Ligand binder design. Structure first.
Ligand SMILES: Nc1ncnc2c1ncn2[C@@H]1O[C@H](COP(=O)(O)OP(=O)(O)O)[C@@H](O)[C@H]1O
Length: 683
């Protein structure tokens, strides 16, 4: 499997010669969303033996365990440029053969510009000239980092520090000086009207191919269209910046072998000894040009064409495009950086500082727990029957009709149904398993949320607060916390806790530690905050308990809870003249009874607003989960007050968790299924 845009029958020719030498016939096909279908089909132990695609999507298949560990000897590795092998490396395993190589180059109008500039610094001057003569120095696509990054990386920007065939996921080069200088100089071109911020791909292409501008930046795909344009063009090295080369992301067309294929040995023989040779690549190139190639020997032939030469010069000076899931997060962080600094609505420093922290953001998954409580007094009186069960991980709902069985897996399932059961879940168990780690995250400097989700009676309060005979999460957490402060607090580090306790009622904010509506506002770095919310210093749990008593006295009636209570602990961790502060927000949120209890006043507005608010929470949480698995999505924080307020404590580097409580009873099976399905929403 190779692409349709490539040279298929040329590759078939190399297979048509493989049969001759071996006797084994060749499999060359170019089907469909081949890249999108390959993981669909390779996942079930099918697909082709060999797949040809760019290394972009190869990093994923590898993670999915889909490609085999290739095993060329050094002798063979030495035949291709050493940098190309970094493309086809995942989790420190060689997982494909580099084939072709692709990179942005400087493209210029020989007629307008016989001697193109070596140097970015030249362009303003160059431009001033061409504009006086009714033309322009340079137009390229300023909309997307793929194109802008090269200049940005020149003085030292980088996406993820790559060392031991490892990308330090945590080491990002978007904030740094090298990146500031590139973006700054870029932005200046714009400021000084040497380029337009609105310039995208088509404008740029149109302009260059019509003879309106002297220069553009594009990749070999763009050549053909110039050819048709009859514009007299040259393709060359990108300009230096601060005497350092521009660093475009390199795209390596690479050939991997299916982990499923039994032809692993035969495939290797084919790629190494047939395809990857002067003859073998010429066969393909002749059909449809490979651009620059990884095979040193043949590239040297190809680089006779100085356009190709230059794709190579620039690929080598560039950086292999990371095939990791975090690249997305990077792409979008930097896109937004550049858009806003080019706009002038935001300084370079602030743009890139914002982008660093989005590109470097953990995006940890949301932890979902479930707890099934014992039969309530009321349910026993109702002669209630069990409809909820455990099996191993799985919580299973078996409808009385016995046709309907719904099952669910959460990160953890707390089975507190029968105080007996060899896996019964006590209060301590619930704490140690779900919340303790949050406290460890809080101490590491991460913001955290614990949401408590369920219908009235399902055990939210029991779980969160508890009773003197049986203390729930909040009390244990605080006493864990304070005992750890005691431990940790030293002449090196100091701990300070403040506490706010508010509620979201009908999307309004009410402070429970004093009912007037407080206004939400937003800081552009530190995010949403409540204007006029009390922050009471705390020193022990007893302090908090006072406060949570005062607060809960003023929360919500029916006795159902009809607001979302937000218990918050801001903890400042001051070390020392030279003394930083590390801030963790800890939000413990008792959500409102999920009952969609809709029958026959302002009690209704509540219901409406609770359903709406909880739906939005779920949406964002769901978005979070998807985000955490690396896919670009929109997170509707702003769509609900609770979610907007906790924005900075939800995503980013934050640690979010939810405990859904349910009733084991047949009476409640529908709300139980609402809850459990909700909690799945959250993966
Ligand atoms: N996991 C549990 N194990 C034993 N009893 C529970 C459990 N959860 C709730 N209960 C019992 O049910 C009562 C009501 O619990 P509660 O958490 O207030 O539900 P909600 O907070 O949603 O109203 C508690 O006082 C307790 O006796």
């Amino acid at each position: 499997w190779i692409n349709g845009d490539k040279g298929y029958n040329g590759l078939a020719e190399v297979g048509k010669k493989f049969e001759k030498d071996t006797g084994i016939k060749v499999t060359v096909e170019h089907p469909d969303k081949l890249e999108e279908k390959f993981p669909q089909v390779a996942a079930t132990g099918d697909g082709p033996d060999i797949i040809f695609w760019a290394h972009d999507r190869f990093g994923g298949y590898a993670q999915s365990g889909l490609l085999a560990e290739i095993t060329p000897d050094k002798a063979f590795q030495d035949k291709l440029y050493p940098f190309t092998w970094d493309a086809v490396r995942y989790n420190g395993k060689l997982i494909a053969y580099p084939i072709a190589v692709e990179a942005l180059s400087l493209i210029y109008n020989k007629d307008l510009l016989p001697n193109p500039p070596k140097t970015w610094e030249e362009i303003p001057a160059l431009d001033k000239e061409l504009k006086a003569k009714g033309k322009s120095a340079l137009m390229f696509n300023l909309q997307e980092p793929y194109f802008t990054w090269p200049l940005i990386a020149a003085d030292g920007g980088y996406a993820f520090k790559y060392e031991n065939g490892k990308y330090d996921i945590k080491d990002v080069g978007v904030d740094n000086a090298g990146a500031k200088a590139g973006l700054t100089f870029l932005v200046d071109l714009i400021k000084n009207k040497h380029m337009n911020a609105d310039t995208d791909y088509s404008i740029a292409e149109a302009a260059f191919n019509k003879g309106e501008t002297a220069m553009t930046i594009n990749g070999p795909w763009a050549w053909s269209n110039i050819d048709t344009s009859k514009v007299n063009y040259g393709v060359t090295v990108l300009p230096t910046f601060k005497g350092q080369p521009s660093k475009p992301f390199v795209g390596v067309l690479s050939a991997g072998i299916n982990a499923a294929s039994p032809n692993k040995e035969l495939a290797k023989e084919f790629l190494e000894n047939y395809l990857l040779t002067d003859e073998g690549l010429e066969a393909v190139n002749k059909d449809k040009p490979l651009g620059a190639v990884a095979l040193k020997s043949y590239e040297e032939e190809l680089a006779k064409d100085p356009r190709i030469a230059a794709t190579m010069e620039n690929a080598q000076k560039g950086e292999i495009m990371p095939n990791i899931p975090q690249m997305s997060a990077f792409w979008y962080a930097v896109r937004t950086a550049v858009i806003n600094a080019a706009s002038g609505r935001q300084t370079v420093d602030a743009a890139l500082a914002a982008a660093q922290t989005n590109a470097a953001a953990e995006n940890s998954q949301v932890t979902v727990a479930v707890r099934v409580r014992p039969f309530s007094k009321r349910e026993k009186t109702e002669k209630a029957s069990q409809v909820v069960f455990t099996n191993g991980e799985e919580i299973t709902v078996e409808h009385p009709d016995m046709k309907q069985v719904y099952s669910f897996i959460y990160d953890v399932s707390f089975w507190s149904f029968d105080e007996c059961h060899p896996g019964y879940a006590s209060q301590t168990t619930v704490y140690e398993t779900l919340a303790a780690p949050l406290l460890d995250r809080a101490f590491e400097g991460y913001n955290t949320c614990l949401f408590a989700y369920g219908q009235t009676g399902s055990g939210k309060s029991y779980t969160m607060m508890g009773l003197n005979e049986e203390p729930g999460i909040i009390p244990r957490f605080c006493e864990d916390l304070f005992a750890q402060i005691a431990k940790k607090q030293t002449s090196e580090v100091s701990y300070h806790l403040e506490m706010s306790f508010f509620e979201v009622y009908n999307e309004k904010i009410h402070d429970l530690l004093v009912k007037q509506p407080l206004r939400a506002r937003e800081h552009p770095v530190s995010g949403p905050y409540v204007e006029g919310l009390s922050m009471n210093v705390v020193s022990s749990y007893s302090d908090i308990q006072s406060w949570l008593e005062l607060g809960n006295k003023q929360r919500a009636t029916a006795k159902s809870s009809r607001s979302h209570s937000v218990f918050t602990l801001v903890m400042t961790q001051t070390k020392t003249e030279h003394d930083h502060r590390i801030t963790s927000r800890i939000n413990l949120v008792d959500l409102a009874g999920s009952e969609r209890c809709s029958t026959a006043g302002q009690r209704l507005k509540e219901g409406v607003s609770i359903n709406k608010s909880l739906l939005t929470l779920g949406k964002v949480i769901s978005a979070l989960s998807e985000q955490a698995n690396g896919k670009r999505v929109f997170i509707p924080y702003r769509e609900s007050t609770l979610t907007w307020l906790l924005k900075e404590s939800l995503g980013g580097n934050s640690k979010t968790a939810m405990i859904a409580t349910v009733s084991p009873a047949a009476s409640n099976i529908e709300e139980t299924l609402s809850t459990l399905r909700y909690a799945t929403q959250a993966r």
